[PDB]
Design an enzyme around this catalytic site. Sequence first.
Site, PDB file in Angstrom:
ATOM      1  N   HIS A  61     -33.324 -23.317  51.963  1.00  0.00           N
ATOM      2  CA  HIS A  61     -32.452 -24.408  52.348  1.00  0.00           C
ATOM      3  C   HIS A  61     -32.881 -24.999  53.672  1.00  0.00           C
ATOM      4  O   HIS A  61     -32.502 -26.126  53.991  1.00  0.00           O
ATOM      5  CB  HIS A  61     -31.018 -23.932  52.537  1.00  0.00           C
ATOM      6  CG  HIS A  61     -30.606 -22.916  51.524  1.00  0.00           C
ATOM      7  ND1 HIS A  61     -30.669 -21.560  51.797  1.00  0.00           N
ATOM      8  CD2 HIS A  61     -30.307 -23.028  50.205  1.00  0.00           C
ATOM      9  CE1 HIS A  61     -30.321 -20.883  50.717  1.00  0.00           C
ATOM     10  NE2 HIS A  61     -30.107 -21.749  49.736  1.00  0.00           N
ATOM     11  N   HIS A  91     -31.734 -23.049  63.224  1.00  0.00           N
ATOM     12  CA  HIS A  91     -32.385 -23.705  62.098  1.00  0.00           C
ATOM     13  C   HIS A  91     -32.183 -25.200  62.266  1.00  0.00           C
ATOM     14  O   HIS A  91     -31.502 -25.649  63.201  1.00  0.00           O
ATOM     15  CB  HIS A  91     -31.814 -23.242  60.748  1.00  0.00           C
ATOM     16  CG  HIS A  91     -30.347 -23.497  60.615  1.00  0.00           C
ATOM     17  ND1 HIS A  91     -29.395 -22.640  61.120  1.00  0.00           N
ATOM     18  CD2 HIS A  91     -29.674 -24.579  60.153  1.00  0.00           C
ATOM     19  CE1 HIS A  91     -28.195 -23.151  60.901  1.00  0.00           C
ATOM     20  NE2 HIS A  91     -28.339 -24.320  60.312  1.00  0.00           N
ATOM     21  N   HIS A  93     -31.662 -29.235  60.207  1.00  0.00           N
ATOM     22  CA  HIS A  93     -31.382 -30.109  59.072  1.00  0.00           C
ATOM     23  C   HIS A  93     -32.125 -31.400  59.355  1.00  0.00           C
ATOM     24  O   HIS A  93     -32.089 -31.873  60.490  1.00  0.00           O
ATOM     25  CB  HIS A  93     -29.885 -30.387  58.963  1.00  0.00           C
ATOM     26  CG  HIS A  93     -29.068 -29.146  58.773  1.00  0.00           C
ATOM     27  ND1 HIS A  93     -28.946 -28.534  57.547  1.00  0.00           N
ATOM     28  CD2 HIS A  93     -28.465 -28.321  59.667  1.00  0.00           C
ATOM     29  CE1 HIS A  93     -28.211 -27.442  57.676  1.00  0.00           C
ATOM     30  NE2 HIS A  93     -27.937 -27.278  58.957  1.00  0.00           N
ATOM     31  N   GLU A 103     -26.540 -33.902  60.454  1.00  0.00           N
ATOM     32  CA  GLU A 103     -25.303 -33.609  59.758  1.00  0.00           C
ATOM     33  C   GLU A 103     -24.119 -34.279  60.438  1.00  0.00           C
ATOM     34  O   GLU A 103     -23.396 -35.051  59.804  1.00  0.00           O
ATOM     35  CB  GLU A 103     -25.138 -32.092  59.645  1.00  0.00           C
ATOM     36  CG  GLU A 103     -26.128 -31.558  58.632  1.00  0.00           C
ATOM     37  CD  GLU A 103     -25.876 -30.135  58.236  1.00  0.00           C
ATOM     38  OE1 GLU A 103     -25.249 -29.371  58.995  1.00  0.00           O
ATOM     39  OE2 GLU A 103     -26.136 -29.846  57.048  1.00  0.00           O
ATOM     40  N   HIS A 116     -29.218 -26.488  64.939  1.00  0.00           N
ATOM     41  CA  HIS A 116     -28.049 -25.613  64.995  1.00  0.00           C
ATOM     42  C   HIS A 116     -28.471 -24.269  65.574  1.00  0.00           C
ATOM     43  O   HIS A 116     -29.265 -23.545  64.961  1.00  0.00           O
ATOM     44  CB  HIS A 116     -27.415 -25.473  63.615  1.00  0.00           C
ATOM     45  CG  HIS A 116     -26.795 -26.743  63.118  1.00  0.00           C
ATOM     46  ND1 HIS A 116     -26.482 -26.956  61.797  1.00  0.00           N
ATOM     47  CD2 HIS A 116     -26.348 -27.832  63.791  1.00  0.00           C
ATOM     48  CE1 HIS A 116     -25.929 -28.148  61.661  1.00  0.00           C
ATOM     49  NE2 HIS A 116     -25.826 -28.700  62.858  1.00  0.00           N
ATOM     50  N   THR A 195     -21.820 -25.455  57.612  1.00  0.00           N
ATOM     51  CA  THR A 195     -22.104 -26.626  56.790  1.00  0.00           C
ATOM     52  C   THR A 195     -22.950 -26.282  55.572  1.00  0.00           C
ATOM     53  O   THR A 195     -23.383 -27.188  54.849  1.00  0.00           O
ATOM     54  CB  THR A 195     -22.805 -27.700  57.605  1.00  0.00           C
ATOM     55  OG1 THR A 195     -24.078 -27.195  57.993  1.00  0.00           O
ATOM     56  CG2 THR A 195     -21.993 -28.029  58.867  1.00  0.00           C
TER      57      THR A 195
HETATM   58  N1  LIG Z   1     -25.241 -25.193  58.915  1.00  0.00           N
HETATM   59  S1  LIG Z   1     -24.519 -24.178  60.095  1.00  0.00           S
HETATM   60  O1  LIG Z   1     -22.914 -24.558  60.138  1.00  0.00           O
HETATM   61  O2  LIG Z   1     -25.259 -24.060  61.557  1.00  0.00           O
HETATM   62  C1  LIG Z   1     -24.506 -22.502  59.413  1.00  0.00           C
HETATM   63  C2  LIG Z   1     -24.274 -22.386  58.058  1.00  0.00           C
HETATM   64  C3  LIG Z   1     -24.247 -21.126  57.507  1.00  0.00           C
HETATM   65  C4  LIG Z   1     -24.462 -20.018  58.311  1.00  0.00           C
HETATM   66  N2  LIG Z   1     -24.385 -18.764  57.614  1.00  0.00           N
HETATM   67  C5  LIG Z   1     -24.402 -18.682  56.292  1.00  0.00           C
HETATM   68  C6  LIG Z   1     -24.267 -17.347  55.985  1.00  0.00           C
HETATM   69  N3  LIG Z   1     -24.160 -16.693  57.129  1.00  0.00           N
HETATM   70  C7  LIG Z   1     -23.978 -15.267  57.255  1.00  0.00           C
HETATM   71  C8  LIG Z   1     -24.928 -14.450  57.855  1.00  0.00           C
HETATM   72  C9  LIG Z   1     -24.676 -13.085  57.936  1.00  0.00           C
HETATM   73  C10 LIG Z   1     -23.486 -12.562  57.432  1.00  0.00           C
HETATM   74  F1  LIG Z   1     -23.229 -11.225  57.522  1.00  0.00           F
HETATM   75  C11 LIG Z   1     -22.544 -13.390  56.841  1.00  0.00           C
HETATM   76  C12 LIG Z   1     -22.791 -14.749  56.756  1.00  0.00           C
HETATM   77  F2  LIG Z   1     -21.873 -15.587  56.171  1.00  0.00           F
HETATM   78  C13 LIG Z   1     -24.211 -17.555  58.139  1.00  0.00           C
HETATM   79  O3  LIG Z   1     -24.143 -17.276  59.292  1.00  0.00           O
HETATM   80  C14 LIG Z   1     -24.694 -20.128  59.682  1.00  0.00           C
HETATM   81  C15 LIG Z   1     -24.726 -21.400  60.237  1.00  0.00           C
HETATM   82 ZN   LIG Z   2     -26.980 -25.850  60.110  1.00  0.00          ZN
END
Ligand SMILES: NS(=O)(=O)c1ccc(-n2ccn(-c3ccc(F)cc3F)c2=O)cc1
Ligand SMILES: [Zn+2]
Length: 257
Positions: A61, A91, A93, A103, A116, A195
């Site tokens: 992703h 990471h 986007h 975003e 992010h 997100t």
């Molecule tokens: N796009 S963002 O809002 O910066 C964003 C979106 C998703 C995450 N993300 C997704 C899954 N996880 C995660 C990692 C480790 C864990 F144990 C549980 C989680 F949900 C997480 O931190 C982290 C950041």
């Molecule tokens: Zn993100």
Amino acid sequence: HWGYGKHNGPEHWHKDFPIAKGERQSPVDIDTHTAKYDPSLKPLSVSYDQATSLRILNNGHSFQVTFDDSQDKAVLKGGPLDGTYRLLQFHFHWGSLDGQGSEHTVDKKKYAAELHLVHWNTKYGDVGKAVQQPDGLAVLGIFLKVGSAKPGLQKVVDVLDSIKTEGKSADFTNFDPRGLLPESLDYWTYPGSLTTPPLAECVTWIVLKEPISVSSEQVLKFRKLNFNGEGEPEELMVDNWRPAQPLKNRQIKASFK
Ligand SMILES: NS(=O)(=O)c1ccc(-n2ccn(-c3ccc(F)cc3F)c2=O)cc1
Ligand SMILES: [Zn+2]
């Protein structure tokens, strides 16, 4: 599973993750004239001098640089936050074109990309617990516009060719995330969500006013990554952004006048 195509993209996510239609989803449009200056917001505290990066990863992703969060080494504090947030990863986007990719938007303006920096609240012990909490995570968002290169991004750019396809990763030590930060830490802040799935409503969003500038060559490097795994039909990793979500009953506050 979910992705960013016609048939599995952000409009489809609510079927697997019904919180997608929730009361505090991200990203949002930041309407700069409606955000209210809050003089009680403290300056943001970014302490990254001891950051230990570990790995860089294509997760299908996006691409992610992961840090050692087993100690308070790179932490975020102050701003709107209470208590300690450890940096886990960053990471990006980005778009297929320079006019899209971010975003969050600013008065409906889309930036070419958005960084992010993801932090979790040490009171909750681990990021898995933290995502289950309305104040579990703080994500620092930084917009990227296309112009002059960002020298501090180049070590990231340079390794992406080794993690072209989902599931590849590389050792990626001694990367200093301070080289990704703009001059000003003026910020907007609102309560929101991840997100990407699971879209959990656990994030205090802190979005910096000042973008960083990256070069066309740097952003092209992003666009050469792939959503697919190797040996599979090539689908360029582009337009991996969620569009702005309804603000609903939320107020965006500004740390600056
Ligand atoms: N796009 S963002 O809002 O910066 C964003 C979106 C998703 C995450 N993300 C997704 C899954 N996880 C995660 C990692 C480790 C864990 F144990 C549980 C989680 F949900 C997480 O931190 C982290 C950041
Ligand atoms: Zn993100």
